[PDB]
Motif scaffolding. Structure first.
Motif, PDB file in Angstrom:
ATOM      1  N   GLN A 127     -13.190  -2.902 -10.847  1.00 47.21           N
ATOM      2  CA  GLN A 127     -13.732  -4.056 -10.154  1.00 47.21           C
ATOM      3  C   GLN A 127     -12.673  -4.721  -9.314  1.00 47.21           C
ATOM      4  O   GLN A 127     -11.495  -4.680  -9.656  1.00 47.21           O
ATOM      5  CB  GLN A 127     -14.298  -5.058 -11.144  1.00 47.21           C
ATOM      6  CG  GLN A 127     -15.419  -4.532 -11.954  1.00 47.21           C
ATOM      7  CD  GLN A 127     -16.645  -4.309 -11.116  1.00 47.21           C
ATOM      8  OE1 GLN A 127     -17.134  -5.249 -10.482  1.00 47.21           O
ATOM      9  NE2 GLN A 127     -17.152  -3.090 -11.100  1.00 47.21           N
ATOM     10  N   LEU A 128     -13.104  -5.382  -8.265  1.00 46.88           N
ATOM     11  CA  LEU A 128     -12.261  -6.146  -7.386  1.00 46.88           C
ATOM     12  C   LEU A 128     -12.142  -7.549  -7.935  1.00 46.88           C
ATOM     13  O   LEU A 128     -13.134  -8.259  -8.089  1.00 46.88           O
ATOM     14  CB  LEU A 128     -12.892  -6.174  -5.988  1.00 46.88           C
ATOM     15  CG  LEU A 128     -13.095  -4.823  -5.275  1.00 46.88           C
ATOM     16  CD1 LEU A 128     -13.941  -5.021  -4.055  1.00 46.88           C
ATOM     17  CD2 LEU A 128     -11.747  -4.268  -4.858  1.00 46.88           C
ATOM     18  N   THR A 129     -10.919  -7.924  -8.232  1.00 50.31           N
ATOM     19  CA  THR A 129     -10.544  -9.180  -8.839  1.00 50.31           C
ATOM     20  C   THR A 129     -10.089 -10.200  -7.832  1.00 50.31           C
ATOM     21  O   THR A 129      -9.883  -9.873  -6.671  1.00 50.31           O
ATOM     22  CB  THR A 129      -9.441  -8.927  -9.858  1.00 50.31           C
ATOM     23  OG1 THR A 129      -8.297  -8.351  -9.185  1.00 50.31           O
ATOM     24  CG2 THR A 129      -9.946  -7.956 -10.924  1.00 50.31           C
ATOM     25  N   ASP A 130      -9.905 -11.437  -8.287  1.00 49.36           N
ATOM     26  CA  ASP A 130      -9.450 -12.522  -7.425  1.00 49.36           C
ATOM     27  C   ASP A 130      -7.982 -12.378  -7.032  1.00 49.36           C
ATOM     28  O   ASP A 130      -7.554 -12.877  -5.995  1.00 49.36           O
ATOM     29  CB  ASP A 130      -9.656 -13.847  -8.127  1.00 49.36           C
ATOM     30  CG  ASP A 130     -11.139 -14.208  -8.306  1.00 49.36           C
ATOM     31  OD1 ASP A 130     -12.006 -13.629  -7.652  1.00 49.36           O
ATOM     32  OD2 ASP A 130     -11.385 -15.059  -9.126  1.00 49.36           O
ATOM     33  N   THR A 131      -7.200 -11.732  -7.877  1.00 53.54           N
ATOM     34  CA  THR A 131      -5.802 -11.452  -7.608  1.00 53.54           C
ATOM     35  C   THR A 131      -5.706  -9.999  -7.193  1.00 53.54           C
ATOM     36  O   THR A 131      -6.692  -9.271  -7.299  1.00 53.54           O
ATOM     37  CB  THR A 131      -4.935 -11.721  -8.842  1.00 53.54           C
ATOM     38  OG1 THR A 131      -5.351 -10.849  -9.910  1.00 53.54           O
ATOM     39  CG2 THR A 131      -5.079 -13.183  -9.266  1.00 53.54           C
ATOM     40  N   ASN A 132      -4.551  -9.557  -6.714  1.00 55.34           N
ATOM     41  CA  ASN A 132      -4.403  -8.152  -6.356  1.00 55.34           C
ATOM     42  C   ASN A 132      -4.396  -7.277  -7.607  1.00 55.34           C
ATOM     43  O   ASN A 132      -3.989  -7.733  -8.679  1.00 55.34           O
ATOM     44  CB  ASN A 132      -3.143  -7.945  -5.579  1.00 55.34           C
ATOM     45  CG  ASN A 132      -1.966  -8.339  -6.377  1.00 55.34           C
ATOM     46  OD1 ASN A 132      -1.780  -9.532  -6.661  1.00 55.34           O
ATOM     47  ND2 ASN A 132      -1.172  -7.395  -6.784  1.00 55.34           N
ATOM     48  N   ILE A 133      -4.819  -6.022  -7.474  1.00 57.22           N
ATOM     49  CA  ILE A 133      -4.828  -5.136  -8.637  1.00 57.22           C
ATOM     50  C   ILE A 133      -3.741  -4.088  -8.526  1.00 57.22           C
ATOM     51  O   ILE A 133      -3.739  -3.274  -7.607  1.00 57.22           O
ATOM     52  CB  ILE A 133      -6.144  -4.379  -8.768  1.00 57.22           C
ATOM     53  CG1 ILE A 133      -7.303  -5.355  -8.811  1.00 57.22           C
ATOM     54  CG2 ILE A 133      -6.110  -3.588 -10.081  1.00 57.22           C
ATOM     55  CD1 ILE A 133      -8.653  -4.715  -8.622  1.00 57.22           C
ATOM     56  N   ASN A 134      -2.836  -4.089  -9.480  1.00 57.51           N
ATOM     57  CA  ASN A 134      -1.690  -3.187  -9.480  1.00 57.51           C
ATOM     58  C   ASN A 134      -1.990  -1.873 -10.231  1.00 57.51           C
ATOM     59  O   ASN A 134      -1.985  -1.848 -11.463  1.00 57.51           O
ATOM     60  CB  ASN A 134      -0.545  -3.972 -10.092  1.00 57.51           C
ATOM     61  CG  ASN A 134       0.776  -3.339 -10.122  1.00 57.51           C
ATOM     62  OD1 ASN A 134       0.963  -2.136  -9.966  1.00 57.51           O
ATOM     63  ND2 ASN A 134       1.758  -4.184 -10.325  1.00 57.51           N
ATOM     64  N   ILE A 135      -2.280  -0.787  -9.495  1.00 55.36           N
ATOM     65  CA  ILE A 135      -2.702   0.476 -10.113  1.00 55.36           C
ATOM     66  C   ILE A 135      -1.706   1.618  -9.932  1.00 55.36           C
ATOM     67  O   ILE A 135      -1.428   2.007  -8.804  1.00 55.36           O
ATOM     68  CB  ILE A 135      -3.988   0.964  -9.420  1.00 55.36           C
ATOM     69  CG1 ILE A 135      -5.060  -0.087  -9.520  1.00 55.36           C
ATOM     70  CG2 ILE A 135      -4.456   2.288 -10.046  1.00 55.36           C
ATOM     71  CD1 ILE A 135      -6.247   0.174  -8.652  1.00 55.36           C
ATOM     72  N   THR A 136      -1.222   2.236 -11.006  1.00 56.33           N
ATOM     73  CA  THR A 136      -0.316   3.375 -10.776  1.00 56.33           C
ATOM     74  C   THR A 136      -0.967   4.672 -11.169  1.00 56.33           C
ATOM     75  O   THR A 136      -1.464   4.830 -12.284  1.00 56.33           O
ATOM     76  CB  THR A 136       1.040   3.245 -11.477  1.00 56.33           C
ATOM     77  OG1 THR A 136       1.707   2.077 -10.985  1.00 56.33           O
ATOM     78  CG2 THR A 136       1.914   4.494 -11.147  1.00 56.33           C
ATOM     79  N   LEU A 137      -0.977   5.593 -10.221  1.00 54.87           N
ATOM     80  CA  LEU A 137      -1.601   6.883 -10.413  1.00 54.87           C
ATOM     81  C   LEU A 137      -0.644   8.041 -10.250  1.00 54.87           C
ATOM     82  O   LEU A 137       0.317   7.976  -9.479  1.00 54.87           O
ATOM     83  CB  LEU A 137      -2.713   7.049  -9.387  1.00 54.87           C
ATOM     84  CG  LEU A 137      -3.747   5.939  -9.365  1.00 54.87           C
ATOM     85  CD1 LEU A 137      -4.659   6.146  -8.248  1.00 54.87           C
ATOM     86  CD2 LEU A 137      -4.554   5.901 -10.657  1.00 54.87           C
ATOM     87  N   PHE A 138      -0.934   9.138 -10.934  1.00 55.11           N
ATOM     88  CA  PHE A 138      -0.178  10.347 -10.686  1.00 55.11           C
ATOM     89  C   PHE A 138      -0.951  11.202  -9.752  1.00 55.11           C
ATOM     90  O   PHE A 138      -2.099  11.551 -10.027  1.00 55.11           O
ATOM     91  CB  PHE A 138       0.064  11.185 -11.910  1.00 55.11           C
ATOM     92  CG  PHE A 138       0.869  12.402 -11.563  1.00 55.11           C
ATOM     93  CD1 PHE A 138       2.150  12.274 -11.108  1.00 55.11           C
ATOM     94  CD2 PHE A 138       0.347  13.676 -11.683  1.00 55.11           C
ATOM     95  CE1 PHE A 138       2.892  13.345 -10.796  1.00 55.11           C
ATOM     96  CE2 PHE A 138       1.113  14.777 -11.365  1.00 55.11           C
ATOM     97  CZ  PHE A 138       2.384  14.605 -10.931  1.00 55.11           C
ATOM     98  N   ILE A 139      -0.343  11.530  -8.653  1.00 55.42           N
ATOM     99  CA  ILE A 139      -0.979  12.354  -7.683  1.00 55.42           C
ATOM    100  C   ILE A 139      -0.377  13.738  -7.736  1.00 55.42           C
ATOM    101  O   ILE A 139       0.825  13.899  -7.531  1.00 55.42           O
ATOM    102  CB  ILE A 139      -0.834  11.726  -6.312  1.00 55.42           C
ATOM    103  CG1 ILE A 139      -1.549  10.371  -6.358  1.00 55.42           C
ATOM    104  CG2 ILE A 139      -1.368  12.667  -5.219  1.00 55.42           C
ATOM    105  CD1 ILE A 139      -1.312   9.492  -5.211  1.00 55.42           C
ATOM    106  N   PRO A 140      -1.152  14.750  -8.088  1.00 59.36           N
ATOM    107  CA  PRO A 140      -0.715  16.103  -8.203  1.00 59.36           C
ATOM    108  C   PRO A 140      -0.531  16.649  -6.834  1.00 59.36           C
ATOM    109  O   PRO A 140      -1.215  16.217  -5.908  1.00 59.36           O
ATOM    110  CB  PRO A 140      -1.896  16.773  -8.872  1.00 59.36           C
ATOM    111  CG  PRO A 140      -3.075  15.989  -8.387  1.00 59.36           C
ATOM    112  CD  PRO A 140      -2.590  14.581  -8.234  1.00 59.36           C
TER     113      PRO A 140
END
Lengths: 48, 49
Positions: free
Chosen positions: A34-47
């Motif tokens: 979901q899109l929150t009121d603050t920024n969302i910090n997401i870390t992903l592993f990209i193969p």
């Protein structure tokens, strides 16, 4: 992900991240949330 | 700030960090370029510095 703004995102707080051009040219889901009121910090592993 | 025995060195993000992180209050990560430290000058007490 920038903070939610109805005027730029729509009436829904729904969003997803997708990957392409690794293995194939199909769009695959790598993150959802979901899109929150603050920024969302997401870390992903990209193969590769 | 680096304390290395008799040596003293400092590094600063505006010279050492090539990419400025975004401003969010949530988390600002400053990734520095390799910082060269003068290991010579270390006091190896009981062979350990």
């Amino acid at each position: 992900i920038p903070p939610y703004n109805l005027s730029t995102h729509g009436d829904e707080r729904w969003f997803k991240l997708y990957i392409k051009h690794v293995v194939d040219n199909n769009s695959h889901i790598i993150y959802s949330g979901q899109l929150t009121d603050t920024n969302i910090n997401i870390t992903l592993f990209i193969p590769l | 700030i680096v304390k290395a025995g008799g040596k003293e060195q400092t590094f600063t993000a505006d010279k050492d960090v090539s990419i400025q992180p975004s401003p969010s209050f949530d988390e600002m990560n400053y990734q520095f370029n390799a910082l060269e430290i003068d290991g010579s000058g270390l006091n190896f007490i009981n062979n350990s510095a």
